[PDB]
């Protein structure tokens, strides 16, 4: 509901549109298991799409960690110190491209 959840006013970070537009997403942090069906579509995302994504916006620095994880995560860190950790557990490559592009588009 809305009375149990906090609320806020619609703002931007440092007047994000006025002078120039600044990409608000600093770091992505993929942690992808080498052997494991949970991070399969993550692996196919690293083999295919994370390089073209990394070139389509160079203001984002990307850390693929490749450790023996049991649930893969992506950790979006934003310019204002906000850290949104979302799971890419058992998600296909297209769904991780829409998820990572969703984290890139927002603030």
């Amino acid at each position: 509901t809305a009375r149990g959840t906090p609320s806020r006013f619609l703002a931007s970070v440092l007047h994000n549109g006025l002078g120039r537009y600044v990409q608000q997403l600093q770091r992505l942090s993929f942690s992808v298991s080498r052997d494991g069906a949970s991070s399969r579509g993550a692996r196919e995302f690293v083999e295919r799409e994370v390089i073209d994504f990394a070139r389509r916006n160079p203001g984002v620095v990307i850390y693929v960690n490749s450790r023996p994880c049991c649930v893969p995560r992506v950790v979006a860190e934003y310019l204002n110190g906000a850290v949104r950790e979302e799971s890419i557990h058992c998600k296909s490559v297209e769904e991780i491209s829409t998820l990572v592009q969703k984290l890139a588009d927002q603030s």
Binding site: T1, A2, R3, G4
Partner: protein, 140 residues
């Protein structure tokens, strides 16, 4: 018990996290919290229609008040802004009524001007030259 439930704390905490601001034992006990949390969600969805309704009647109250400041009433103002093809809606006219009252005064003079052109128009029946603000813009 061969397989009995281990993950049950988290189902109770799925329901009870929405109850953390209730009174009584509704914030604490699961049997009471399920009924009040279900009921709070049903009110939460049925109140979207009431949000739209109450915003619109609130705008009609604000347009009514600020049009009573200029001598008009609400139905003369809205009907005669429709009849000028100035198709501003209620939200915008309430926001002009609050923040930009010269524009709302000029919309009130445009609407009352068109109202008097309707009075003088329906007064002198038969063929007469039309009003100046009474003309319509034909689209094709």
């Amino acid at each position: 018990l061969r397989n009995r439930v281990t993950d049950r704390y988290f189902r109770i905490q799925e329901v009870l996290k929405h109850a953390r601001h209730f009174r009584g034992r509704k914030n604490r006990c699961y049997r009471l919290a399920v009924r009040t949390v279900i009921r709070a969600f049903v009110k939460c969805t049925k109140a979207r229609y009431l949000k739209k309704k109450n915003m619109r009647t609130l705008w009609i109250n604000r347009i009514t008040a600020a049009s009573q400041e200029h001598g008009l009433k609400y139905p003369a103002l809205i009907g005669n802004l429709v009849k000028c093809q100035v198709e501003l809606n209620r939200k915008v006219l309430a926001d002009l009524a609050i923040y930009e009252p010269k524009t709302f005064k000029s919309l009130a003079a445009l609407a009352s001007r068109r109202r008097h052109e309707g009075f003088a128009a329906a007064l002198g029946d038969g063929k007469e030259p039309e009003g100046i603000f009474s003309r319509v813009v034909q689209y094709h």
